[PDB]
Write an enzyme that holds these catalytic residues in place. Structure first.
Site, PDB file in Angstrom:
ATOM      1  N   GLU B 120      37.903  46.316  46.095  1.00 30.58           N
ATOM      2  CA  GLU B 120      38.309  45.715  44.812  1.00 30.58           C
ATOM      3  C   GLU B 120      37.388  44.570  44.354  1.00 30.58           C
ATOM      4  OE1 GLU B 120      39.940  45.995  42.152  1.00 30.58           O
ATOM      5  OE2 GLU B 120      42.042  46.548  42.375  1.00 30.58           O
ATOM      6  N   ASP B 121      37.350  44.324  43.049  1.00 30.60           N
ATOM      7  CA  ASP B 121      36.624  43.179  42.513  1.00 30.60           C
ATOM      8  C   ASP B 121      37.426  41.891  42.781  1.00 30.60           C
ATOM      9  OD1 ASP B 121      38.575  44.117  40.858  1.00 30.60           O
ATOM     10  OD2 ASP B 121      37.548  43.740  38.952  1.00 30.60           O
ATOM     11  N   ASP B 124      44.372  38.807  41.857  1.00 34.91           N
ATOM     12  CA  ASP B 124      45.027  37.752  41.095  1.00 34.91           C
ATOM     13  C   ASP B 124      46.508  37.684  41.477  1.00 34.91           C
ATOM     14  OD1 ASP B 124      45.452  35.686  39.277  1.00 34.91           O
ATOM     15  OD2 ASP B 124      45.588  36.977  37.530  1.00 34.91           O
ATOM     16  N   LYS B 127      49.593  42.354  42.270  1.00 35.02           N
ATOM     17  CA  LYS B 127      50.472  43.465  41.890  1.00 35.02           C
ATOM     18  C   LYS B 127      49.737  44.808  41.841  1.00 35.02           C
ATOM     19  N   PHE B 173      39.620  32.331  34.736  1.00 31.22           N
ATOM     20  CA  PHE B 173      39.255  33.688  34.371  1.00 31.22           C
ATOM     21  C   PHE B 173      37.731  33.859  34.461  1.00 31.22           C
ATOM     22  CE2 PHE B 173      40.672  37.728  32.650  1.00 31.22           C
ATOM     23  CZ  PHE B 173      39.509  38.246  32.073  1.00 31.22           C
ATOM     24  N   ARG B 186      30.569  43.316  31.708  1.00 33.25           N
ATOM     25  CA  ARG B 186      30.366  44.087  32.937  1.00 33.25           C
ATOM     26  C   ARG B 186      28.863  44.208  33.224  1.00 33.25           C
ATOM     27  NH1 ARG B 186      35.587  45.984  34.366  1.00 33.25           N
ATOM     28  NH2 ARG B 186      36.784  46.969  32.670  1.00 33.25           N
TER      29      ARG B 186
HETATM   30  N1  3L4 Z   1      37.559  39.999  34.557  1.00 37.84           N
HETATM   31  C1  3L4 Z   1      38.713  39.377  35.151  1.00 37.84           C
HETATM   32  N2  3L4 Z   1      39.832  40.081  35.222  1.00 37.84           N
HETATM   33  C2  3L4 Z   1      40.970  39.532  35.787  1.00 37.84           C
HETATM   34  C3  3L4 Z   1      40.960  38.261  36.262  1.00 37.84           C
HETATM   35  N3  3L4 Z   1      42.255  38.026  36.746  1.00 37.84           N
HETATM   36  C4  3L4 Z   1      43.017  39.114  36.574  1.00 37.84           C
HETATM   37  N4  3L4 Z   1      42.239  40.046  35.981  1.00 37.84           N
HETATM   38  C5  3L4 Z   1      42.597  41.351  35.574  1.00 37.84           C
HETATM   39  C6  3L4 Z   1      42.436  42.484  36.593  1.00 37.84           C
HETATM   40  N5  3L4 Z   1      43.711  43.269  36.843  1.00 37.84           N
HETATM   41  C7  3L4 Z   1      44.753  42.485  37.619  1.00 37.84           C
HETATM   42  C8  3L4 Z   1      44.644  42.138  39.054  1.00 37.84           C
HETATM   43  P1  3L4 Z   1      46.239  41.590  39.737  1.00 37.84           P
HETATM   44  O1  3L4 Z   1      46.116  41.087  41.206  1.00 37.84           O
HETATM   45  O2  3L4 Z   1      46.789  40.502  38.841  1.00 37.84           O
HETATM   46  O3  3L4 Z   1      47.251  42.784  39.771  1.00 37.84           O
HETATM   47  C9  3L4 Z   1      43.330  44.542  37.327  1.00 37.84           C
HETATM   48  C10 3L4 Z   1      42.218  45.017  36.386  1.00 37.84           C
HETATM   49  O4  3L4 Z   1      41.582  46.196  36.628  1.00 37.84           O
HETATM   50  C11 3L4 Z   1      41.086  46.862  35.522  1.00 37.84           C
HETATM   51  P2  3L4 Z   1      39.237  46.912  35.403  1.00 37.84           P
HETATM   52  O5  3L4 Z   1      38.603  46.624  36.703  1.00 37.84           O
HETATM   53  O6  3L4 Z   1      38.802  45.884  34.328  1.00 37.84           O
HETATM   54  O7  3L4 Z   1      38.900  48.367  34.990  1.00 37.84           O
HETATM   55  C12 3L4 Z   1      39.734  37.505  36.174  1.00 37.84           C
HETATM   56  O8  3L4 Z   1      39.600  36.187  36.629  1.00 37.84           O
HETATM   57  N6  3L4 Z   1      38.678  38.114  35.618  1.00 37.84           N
HETATM   58 MG    MG Z   2      40.084  45.424  40.098  1.00 38.86          MG
HETATM   59 MG    MG Z   3      39.745  44.227  33.300  1.00 38.77          MG
END
Ligand code: 3L4
Ligand code: MG
Ligand code: MG
Ligand code: 3L4
Ligand code: 3L4
Ligand code: 3L4
Ligand code: MG
Ligand code: MG
Ligand code: MG
Ligand code: MG
Ligand code: MG
EC number: 2.4.2.8
Lengths: 203, 204, 200, 198
Positions: B120-121, B124, B127, B173, B186
Site C-alpha cells: 500500500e501507499d 490513514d 478502514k 494530506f 501521481r
Molecule cells: N493522496 C493522499 N491520499 C490520502 C491521504 N490520506 C487518506 N487518503 C486517501 C486514500 N484512501 C484512504 C486510506 P484509509 O486508511 O483512510 O482507509 C484510499 C485511497 O485509495 C485510492 P487511490 O490509491 O488514490 O487509487 C493522503 O495524505 N494523501
Molecule cells: Mg492506497
Molecule cells: Mg486517492
C-alpha cells in the site's frame, strides 16, 4: 524500433545477474534489462515530441504492462522536471484476461482526453483490438499506443503501435513483467525459457 | 521498527532546492519526503522483507492506484537481492483497487494456501486496509503481511500496525510518488504537500 | 542559494532504518544525508549549472579523492540534460592533500572551468586551488561543493553551487573519508568517536 | 570468462534508436555498446570480484582518466553487495594516471587485495608494466571494461566486453579528450574524427 533478428542467439546467463531461483529455468538472455532501459529512455522522448502539447492519460495494460509503464512514465517525468517541454499526466490501469476486461468499469476519465495506452507486447494484435473497441466507447480526444515488444508473426492482423521498443522474432519470451503461467514476471531481463523451465512451471 | 519518523513540526523543503515538474510549480507548497529518501528507505524494507519472508514464495499484491510506485520499486529492490544472493524469494504479482468498491477482486481465490505481501501507499483511518484484510482472509492464505510506504499518526478506530512501514508521518494530506489529489500529482516523484492554489485548481 | 540547510539540532536518522555496510555498523552515530537525498539535490544542481554555464564548453575539474562521487553523479545528471536540445564537457582531475600538497593543467587555459569539490570547511583548500587554477589562465571559474560546513573558523568560501550547508560535525560517506575509510559508504554520516578509534 | 564477446562484424545500432548528446549528433556513427548493457555486465562483474576478492580488505585503484566511469559504477555495485548481505569487508580507493602518476605510497598496497580498474586493454603493455611494479600485496587482480582482440598476451582477471580491433569512444573513453561525456560506447564518424582531430 530496435530489430531483433531471427538468428539472434542472445547471451549466456553466466554473463549476467539473474534471479537465483530461475538459474536453471532460462535458456538465454534475449534482451538485457539495461538495453530495455536505454530504448525506453528514447521512447519517452519520442512520446514527448509527439504528445508534448497536452495533458495525457496513461493507461497501463496489466499485468505484463506494469514494468514498461512505470519505467516509461519515470523517463517522461524526468523530461517534465528538467525540460521546457511538458506532458501533465494522470494514470489508469486496465486488465484483459474470450477476452474479459477488468477495471473498465471506471474509465470516463478517458472521455475527451489524450490517451496513451501502454502495453508489454503485441502478438496477434487481438488483445489490442478488444481494448480499442472499449476505449472507443468513451470517446477520447486522441489515442496513441506504446508497446515494448512487437512480435514478427504471420498470425498478425497488421496492427502497429505508435511507439515500439523492440521488434522480436516469433519466439515466446518472458521477463520484464512478461510471464509463463504467472512465473518470470519477477525478472528484469527479457529471456527465453529452458526445457526444465517449461516442464517445471507448466500449468 | 515503526519506520522513519517524520516529526509533526517537519517543515519540509523549499521547492526551489529540488527538481520538480514545471506544470506543478504553483500547485505544491513544499517537498515533504524527497524521492531519493523514499528509495533509500525502500531498499532497507526489501532487505527486511527478505529477512522475514526469504526462502519462501510470495504473491505480491499491489493496491492501485497509489501503491503502484512503491510496489514497482520495492519489487525491484527485492529482485536485486534475488539475483545477487543464494537466498531468494520467488514472487508472483497481482493487482487490486479499492475506491467502498473493490475492483479486480476475483484473483483473490488464487491466494488460498499462499503467502501474501500486500503493498500500500498509505494508511490513514485504516478502514481500507481492514476491509482488504478481511477480504483476503476469506480465502484462507497461509500467511498475510502488509507493507505500507506511509502511516499517518492519526486516531484509528482499530489499532492496526502493518508489518513493514516506510515512514510514519504527521496527520497532513500528502501527494506525489503516485499518491493523488483527485487524480493529479501521481506524476511526481517526491512526496509533497499541496499549495492552496493547488487545492483550488484541482478541486473536484 | 546557501543550499539545503541542515540545522545544528538536526537529529539525523537511526542507522537501523537504512541499508548500511556491516563493517561500519558500530562505527557510525547517525545517517545525516541519505544517498538518495544527495542524488535529488545533485539533480537540481545539474540544472542550475546548465542554467549558468549552458551553451558553452566546460572543463569539469574533479578534486580527488573525496570529490569523485559527487563529480560522477553531477556529470551524469548534466549528461542527462545534454540528451535534450547542451554543455559539451571535457574532464580533468586534481588532488590536494595536507602544508597543502598538489598531485598537467594546461587544459584549463582559456576554458570555462567547473571545480567539483566534496566539502568546504576552513576554505584553505579552495583558496589554494583557485590560486593555482587561475595561474593557468581560464576564461571563467565556477565552484560546486556538495557540502559547506558552518564554522566560526572562517575565511570562508562561498561556492557558486552548494548542495547542503551542514553543522560543524565531522562527516563521512559518499566518498568523504576518515583516514581513507568510509569512502565505500553511500550515505553521508556522522562518524562515532569509538569509530574514529577503530581506523588509524 | 572472455566477457561478452562482440564480433568483428557487429554493426552496432543506429543513433536514432537511442538518446545521444545533442552536440555529438554528427560526430558519431553507431552506438556500439549501449550504456544499459555496460551496467548489466558491470553488475555481474561486481559479483565476480566479490567472489574472488571479498575475503580480505580491498584497495580499488582507478586508472584515470578513462577508467573513472567504470570504476564508479563497479564500486557502487560492489558497495550494494556489501550492504545487503551480513558479510562484508572494508574497501578503500586510490587514483593513478599512467605515463605511474600520483596515487598514495605503494606501501599502502602491502597485505591488501588490490583491484586495478581499467577502461580498456589493447596491447596490454601498460598493465604488464604496472603489474610488474605493484607487486608484496596479498593479491592483485585487474578489471577492464573492454579487451581488444596485436596483443602481447595479457588478459585481465575480469573482462566486461571483448571487442574488435576498432577505435571506440564513450563511457569516459576519449578521442583527444572528447567523448568522455557520453554514456554509450560508440564509434566516431568521419565528420567527428576530423572535427576533433589533434
Ligand atoms: N493522496 C493522499 N491520499 C490520502 C491521504 N490520506 C487518506 N487518503 C486517501 C486514500 N484512501 C484512504 C486510506 P484509509 O486508511 O483512510 O482507509 C484510499 C485511497 O485509495 C485510492 P487511490 O490509491 O488514490 O487509487 C493522503 O495524505 N494523501
Ligand atoms: Mg492506497
Ligand atoms: Mg486517492
Ligand atoms: N509472456 C509472453 N506472452 C505472450 C507472448 N506472445 C503473446 N503472448 C500473450 C499475451 N496476450 C496476447 C497478445 P495478442 O497481441 O496476441 O492479443 C496478451 C495478454 O496477456 C495478459 P498478462 O500481461 O499476462 O496479464 C510472449 O512472447 N511472451
Ligand atoms: N571527511 C571529512 N573531511 C573534512 C570534514 N571537514 C573538513 N574536512 C577536511 C577536508 N580537507 C580540507 C577542507 P578545508 O576547507 O578546511 O581546506 C580536504 C580533504 O582532503 C582531500 P580527500 O578528498 O580526503 O582525498 C568533514 O566533516 N569530513
Ligand atoms: N579511447 C580509446 N583508446 C584506446 C583504444 N585502443 C587503445 N587505446 C589506447 C589506450 N592507452 C593504452 C592502451 P594499451 O595497448 O597500452 O593496453 C591508454 C590511454 O589512456 C589515457 P586516458 O584514460 O584517456 O587518460 C580505443 O579503442 N579507444
Ligand atoms: Mg499485454
Ligand atoms: Mg500472460
Ligand atoms: Mg575536498
Ligand atoms: Mg580526507
Ligand atoms: Mg586506460
Amino acid at each position: 524500433g530496435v530489430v531483433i533478428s531471427d538468428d539472434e542467439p542472445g547471451y549466456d546467463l553466466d554473463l549476467f545477474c539473474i534471479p537465483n531461483h530461475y538459474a536453471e529455468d532460462l535458456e538465454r538472455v534475449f534482451i538485457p534489462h539495461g538495453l530495455i532501459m536505454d530504448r525506453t529512455e528514447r521512447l519517452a522522448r519520442d512520446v514527448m515530441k509527439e504528445m508534448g502539447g497536452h495533458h495525457i492519460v496513461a493507461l497501463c495494460v496489466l499485468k505484463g504492462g506494469y514494468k514498461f509503464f512505470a519505467d516509461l512514465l519515470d523517463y517522461i517525468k524526468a523530461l517534465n522536471r528538467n525540460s521546457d517541454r511538458s506532458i501533465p499526466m494522470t494514470v489508469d490501469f486496465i486488465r484483459l484476461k474470450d477476452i474479459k476486461v477488468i477495471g473498465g468499469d471506471d474509465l470516463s476519465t478517458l472521455t475527451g482526453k489524450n490517451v496513451l495506452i501502454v502495453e508489454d507486447i503485441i502478438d496477434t494484435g487481438k488483445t489490442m483490438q478488444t481494448l480499442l473497441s472499449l476505449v472507443r466507447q468513451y470517446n477520447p480526444k486522441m489515442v496513441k499506443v506504446a508497446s515494448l515488444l512487437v512480435k514478427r508473426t504471420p498470425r498478425s492482423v497488421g496492427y502497429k503501435p505508435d511507439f515500439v521498443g523492440f521488434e522480436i522474432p516469433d519466439k515466446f519470451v518472458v521477463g520484464y513483467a512478461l510471464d509463463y503461467n504467472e512465473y518470470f514476471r519477477d525478472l528484469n531481463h527479457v529471456c527465453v525459457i529452458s526445457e526444465t523451465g517449461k516442464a517445471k512451471y507448466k500449468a
